[PDB]
Design a protein around this ligand. Structure first.
Ligand SMILES: Cc1n[nH]c(C)c1S(=O)(=O)N(C)C
Ligand SMILES: Cc1n[nH]c(C)c1S(=O)(=O)N(C)C
Ligand SMILES: [Cl-]
Ligand SMILES: [Mg+2]
Ligand SMILES: [Mg+2]
Ligand SMILES: [Mg+2]
Ligand SMILES: [Mg+2]
Lengths: 194, 194
């Protein structure tokens, strides 16, 4: 019933563009929408986000997260490790690479989502969500070496999977941080399950 | 360590604006970043709410109530938690209950309400509260629930069993072109991982 008729560039930055989208509503009335897109896409998706499950024997299983200054938020956020997929990179390879660069950990692919939307009322942005295990007892993960690109500044925070939501709430309460909505959603379902 | 220096408008639409943000990096160097914001954000704790609606009925498995809509930024249909913008002066809880009834017909009961969480913090300042709501599906109010779509709103309801949510989302995606929302997929993945 619904579909795009045309797009009009409103403004294109180096990294972000703002469009005016004309679409057919399901009555047959024509309507307009203000949409954002990244100018970086080729790609299955703009990005990957990594769910990293740190497995060490005789310890709680942890989910490995990153804290970083996010200029659009004007603040520090807590997020899954994540970045854009390089032209001609697979989502899985992007994941293992972003995970290493942001956390120093070397992990294994457990599963990989289709392209999922970030904020579909605003943007066309999409990611692959990639579940990765990290064998924390392996020598390559003993003193994980985080190799960040130019200008990345990333603090690693590992939290126990079985208390993740309470742990995230405490961080928010003490530290004036913003937790990411995917992180929060995953943490909520951990509590809601069964 | 890091902070915003200045935010310079690049282009303002009716609903979204694009800004050059100038910030202090943790080396002491000035850097820039293009950032998206809503135009309308007033005194709300966030732009929006998304509702995790747990439909409970005697001798049924619990369902998660989801919505399917055309999303002009995506150019296609998306499957999401029911969601909408917080009206000026409205509480996240009232906005969540209202949006759930408008989009699905159900009348829910508040269970919990998250802090403001970021939607895509590398891109925008957008935030929501994630509000968990239980729906008493045995109540007559919720028997033949009629959606009250707003002007230009056109929503289908999809209720999927909590205990098989991810497999049921995969089956929907395998059957048509649509995109699952990243917070929905994250929630479904955590229900599997727990
Ligand atoms: C109408 C429209 N265009 N772009 C967006 C975003 C929207 S909106 O209804 O979601 N809104 C005012 C934030
Ligand atoms: C550096 C920058 N600023 N704003 C954005 C968005 C970016 S980006 O190049 O990282 N990108 C397209 C995701
Ligand atoms: Cl796992
Ligand atoms: Mg990153
Ligand atoms: Mg990186
Ligand atoms: Mg909505
Ligand atoms: Mg609505």
């Amino acid at each position: 019933k619904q579909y795009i008729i045309s797009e009009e560039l409103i403004s294109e930055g180096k990294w972000v563009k703002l469009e005016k989208t004309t679409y057919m509503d399901p009555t047959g009335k024509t309507r307009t929408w203000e949409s954002v897109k990244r100018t970086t896409r080729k790609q299955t998706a703009d990005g990957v986000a990594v769910i990293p499950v740190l497995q060490r024997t005789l310890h709680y299983e942890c989910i490995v997260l990153v804290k970083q200054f996010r200029p659009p938020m004007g603040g520090y956020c807590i997020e899954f490790p994540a970045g854009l997929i390089d032209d001609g990179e697979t989502p899985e390879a992007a994941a293992l690479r972003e995970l290493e660069e942001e956390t120093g950990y070397k992990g294994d692919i457990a599963e990989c989502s289709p392209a999922v939307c970030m904020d579909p009322g605003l943007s066309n942005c999409t990611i692959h969500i990639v579940t990765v295990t990290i064998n924390g007892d392996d020598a390559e993960n003993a003193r994980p070496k985080p190799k960040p690109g130019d200008g990345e500044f990333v603090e690693v925070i590992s939290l126990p999977k079985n208390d993740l939501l309470q742990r995230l709430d405490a961080l928010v309460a003490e530290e004036h941080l913003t937790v990411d909505a995917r992180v929060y959603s995953y943490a909520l379902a951990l509590k809601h399950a069964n």
